[PDB]
């Protein structure tokens, strides 16, 4: 199983980006997909999770109301819509598959990351 | 309004008998049919039996037929359930419920439930818990917060109460729901998070009370060196 993130870049404060996480080698419809982020000098921190369609999406305090996760199961891809972006949101963003269909957070497979910089 | 008050629950050995009663008020008891319904964590909500307003017809769930008898005294406004040959799987909260007023050519169910009375079928004997400290250390310390507690193990029956420092410590206390062990005895933990800087100088004592056995146990929880 391979994951690849895309959609990051340089954005102004108050701007919007949309990250994508495409999966190959395995159908991911049955798995929750999570987004994490890491900034220099800090630990990798949870951002949001899209569980299976119908099982809901859950969010970190720092992004509630501004970020929205969604799924395109037909294309084996998940998305993180990021609105009202702040300098504090600058980080590399990663997606991970929860291998546990009952959602205990067994993150075996990770993407390589996409860079997000909020400045100017 | 309508009130139903169950009584008669308790701990019973397998094969013995128990009689529940249900005192009714606020409505003309002799005009309504009545239900017994039970709830256990393993079988959910489960209808047990129905009796007619005049005591004529009675019906029972397959799982209690031949062992349970529903009856009523309309002059005393009381409903009864005699339970014989009790089994472990009969352990549940038993509720009486009033059949609602429906129109002649309709099916019916219940509108008002009592608060229930608990029936526990077990071979275990009344026993207070052993209380062991859950000692804080670097292994239960994260930053300025440390966790400590007490393990309240091998008691029967429910319930137990746990306080901390005679009630002076309530913030950050979690007392967990008991689990029934394979021995037939219950076990739980009560934990609290405290400032790490307080360990070794502030005294922390859990106070465990088990009324069925008249057990009272204070356990001082002291840190370990790891």
């Amino acid at each position: 199983v391979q994951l690849x993130x895309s959609g990051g870049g340089x954005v102004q404060x108050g701007x919007s980006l949309x990250l994508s996480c495409x999966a190959x080698x395995x159908x991911x419809x049955x798995x929750x997909x999570x987004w994490x982020r890491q900034x220099p000098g800090x630990x990798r921190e949870x951002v949001x999770x899209x569980x299976x369609x119908x099982x809901x999406x859950x969010x970190x305090d720092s992004x509630x109301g501004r970020f929205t996760x969604s799924x395109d199961x037909x294309x084996x891809x998940x998305x993180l819509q990021x609105x009202x972006l702040x300098x504090x949101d600058x980080a590399x963003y990663y997606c991970x598959x929860x291998x546990x269909x009952x959602x205990x957070x067994x993150x075996x497979x990770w993407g390589x990351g996409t860079x997000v910089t909020v400045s100017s | 309004q309508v009130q139903l008050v169950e009584s008669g629950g308790g701990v019973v050995q397998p094969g013995r008998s128990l009689r529940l009663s249900c005192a009714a008020s606020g409505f003309t008891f002799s005009n309504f049919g009545m239900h017994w319904i039970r709830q256990s964590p393993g079988k959910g909500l489960e209808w047990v039996a129905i009796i007619w307003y005049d005591g004529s017809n009675t019906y029972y769930a397959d799982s209690v037929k031949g062992r349970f008898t529903i009856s009523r005294d309309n002059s005393k406004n009381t409903l009864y359930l005699q339970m014989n040959s009790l089994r472990a799987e009969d352990t549940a909260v038993y509720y009486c419920a009033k059949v609602w007023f429906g129109e002649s050519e309709d099916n019916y169910s219940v509108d008002v439930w009592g608060q229930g009375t608990t029936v526990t079928v077990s071979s275990a004997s009344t026993k207070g818990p052993s209380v062991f400290p859950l000692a804080p250390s670097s292994k239960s310390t994260s930053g300025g917060t440390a966790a400590l507690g007490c393990l309240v193990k091998d008691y029967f029956p429910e319930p137990v109460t746990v306080s901390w420092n005679s009630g002076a410590l309530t913030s950050g206390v979690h007392t967990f729901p008991a689990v029934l062990q394979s021995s037939g005895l219950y076990s739980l933990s009560s934990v609290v998070t405290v400032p790490s800087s307080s360990l070794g100088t502030q005294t922390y004592i859990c106070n465990v009370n088990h009324k069925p056995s008249n057990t009272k146990v204070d356990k001082k929880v002291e840190p370990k060196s790891c």
Binding site: X32, X36, X43, X46, X48, X49, X54, X56, X58, X59, X60, D61, X64, X98, X102, X103, X104, X105, X106, X107 | I37, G44, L45, E46, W47, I50, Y95, W100, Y108, S109, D111, V112, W113, Q115, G116, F132, P133, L134, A135, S137, K139, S140, S142, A147, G149, L151, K153, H174, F176, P177, A178, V179, Q181, S187, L188, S189, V191, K224, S225, C226
Partner: protein
Amino acid sequence: DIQMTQSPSTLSTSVGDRVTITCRASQSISNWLAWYQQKPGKAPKLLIYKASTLESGVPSRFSGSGSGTEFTLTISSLQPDDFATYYCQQYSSYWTFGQGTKLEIKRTVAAPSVFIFPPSDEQLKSGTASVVCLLNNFYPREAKVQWKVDNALQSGNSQESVTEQDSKDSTYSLSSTLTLSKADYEKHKVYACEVTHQGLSSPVTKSFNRGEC
């Protein structure tokens, strides 16, 4: 015997959401279907009868629909009082309940704090060793605790307990107790609990050495 099934088992939801839960019968029950509400430690309460008629006093944000085998209950705009477990019941042929649908308080994700506690000397003197792993103040409810004794995964010798959602912040806490005999406990050195949760990027392990504490 008519079989009733409800979906979903748990729904994580928020004040103001429109909520619909479903109930299915294994055969036609016409519209002889009731809905009861129950909170922990409390008796059930009648909400809806004949599939769609509200009981007196039930607020207008509740409704029900269906006839035959498929039924729904809908709350148009959820309120805190509605966080509870909902049971359907057919009364077409005797009385059978669904398994219940619990409306759970949705909140933001919080990873657990993890603590481990070695057995006390008092219990060791009595011939048993209980080791406790605590996961404090986390959300959502799903987590995995794995016990490892000298890096060997344990199974069949531990039990878990989970609290109700905290009244203040709606988080969960979880206790896991590994129980061995004194001899089995003294036959090994390293005792660890490894914890996963969707809020954690990597598993969290807490461990001690027998004789270290």
